[PDB]
Amino acid sequence: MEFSGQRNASYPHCLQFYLQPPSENISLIEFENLAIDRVKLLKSVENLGVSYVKGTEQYQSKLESELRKLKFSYRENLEDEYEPRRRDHISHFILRLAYCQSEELRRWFIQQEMDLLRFRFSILPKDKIQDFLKDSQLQFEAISDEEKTLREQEIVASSPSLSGLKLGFESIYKIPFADALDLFRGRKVYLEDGFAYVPLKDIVAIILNEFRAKLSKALALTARSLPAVQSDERLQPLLNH
């Protein structure tokens, strides 16, 4: 037998890249606290850094508690996490203007963002990787995967860092040496005829690099185009102090 009988489209994944402007409304206290709580988070990431080494389980365990406490987006949930995702999106747009006040402050918050992104990419299950790589512009197509076992022999003979198990669990796909730039110029690993046998973390490095490029362009736009919006700026001193 065959039977008969909205915000999902906004953020199909917890990951987001700020292409679309949220064309809606906000309260004063709302945008204020949405940004200010994230200022606390930015400091907290580096406080955790001075506590102990970056990205360990101690980092992971404490960091998710920060997110649950601070009500922003998560390892992706199936219930209404779209509200935290749009809060994250909106508050990100709000955060562009505070620490654009100095390039050192820009670089400071960018660095904790890269750390946070690296953590999130470290958490990812396989299904997340499979659907986000296809649903994003971050396609990076694989070629002739059956050859990977000839490189299970060759890489293992040819690399100090990589191993046969990493061929499968850091699942190997073929893309150019230039997408593994630090690995070719350091000559660290098996690459051949200009092609690299690549796990996800190299594409994460590319994601971080293009994110930095696009964000830097946005910060330049923040420095230049913003004055029509600047009818109120009372929070800026409290934010830069």
Partner 1 sequence: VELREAQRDYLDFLDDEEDQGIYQSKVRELISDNQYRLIVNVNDLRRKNEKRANRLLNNAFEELVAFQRALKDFVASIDATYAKQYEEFYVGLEGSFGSKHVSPRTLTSCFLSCVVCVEGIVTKCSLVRPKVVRSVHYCPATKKTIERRYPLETEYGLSVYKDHQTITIQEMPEKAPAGQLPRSVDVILDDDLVDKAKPGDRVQVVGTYRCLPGYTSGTFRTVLIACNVKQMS
Partner 2 sequence: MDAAEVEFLAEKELVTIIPNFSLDKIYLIGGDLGPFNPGLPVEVPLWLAINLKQRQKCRLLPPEWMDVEKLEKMRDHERKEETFTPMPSPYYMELTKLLLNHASDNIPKADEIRTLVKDMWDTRIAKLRVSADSFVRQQEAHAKLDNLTLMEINTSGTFLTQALNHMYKLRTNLQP
- The least CB distance from residue 191 to partner 2, in Å, is 46
Q: Is 125 in the site for partner 1 (CB under 8 A)?
A: yes
- The least CB distance from residue 69 to partner 1, in Å, is 9
The site string for partner 1 over 160-199 (x = CB under 8 A, - otherwise) reads: ----------------------------------------
Q: Which is nearer to partner 2, 4 or 23 (CB)?
A: 4
What does 125 bind: partner 2, partner 1, none (CB cut-off 5 to 8 Å by kind)?
A: partner 1
Rounded Cα distance, 72 and 86, in Å: 9
Q: How far is CA 172 from CA 104, 145, 155, 198, 199, in A?
A: 38, 8, 11, 5, 5
Phi, psi of 24 (to 5 degrees): -150, -155
Contacts of 141 (CB under 8 A, 6+ apart): none
- The least CB distance from residue 1 to partner 2, in Å, is 4
What does 2 bind: partner 1, partner 2, none (CB cut-off 5 to 8 Å by kind)?
A: partner 2
Q: Which is nearer to partner 2, 1 or 28 (CB)?
A: 1
Rounded Cα distance, 37 and 170, in Å: 35
Q: Which is nearer to partner 2, 1 or 143 (CB)?
A: 1
Q: Is 122 in the site for partner 1 (CB under 8 A)?
A: no
Kindly list the residues in this chain that would bind partner 2 in the complex (CB under 8 A): 1-5
From 129, 134, 137, select the one nearest 171 (Cα to Cα): 129
Amino acid at 3: F
Q: Is 234 in the site for partner 1 (CB under 8 A)?
A: no
Q: What torsion, rounded to 10 degrees, do the Cα atoms 9, 13, 17, 22 define? A: 40
Q: 3-state class of 196 per DSSP?
A: strand
From 120, 77, 97, select the one nearest 34 (Cα to Cα): 97
- The least CB distance from residue 5 to partner 2, in Å, is 8
Rounded Cα distance, 238 and 148, in Å: 55
- The least CB distance from residue 82 to partner 2, in Å, is 25
Q: Is 240 in the site for partner 1 (CB under 8 A)?
A: no
Which residues ranging from 7 to 66 are in contact with partner 1 (CB under 8 A)?
Answer: 65
Residues making contact with partner 1 (CB under 8 A):
65, 68, 75, 125
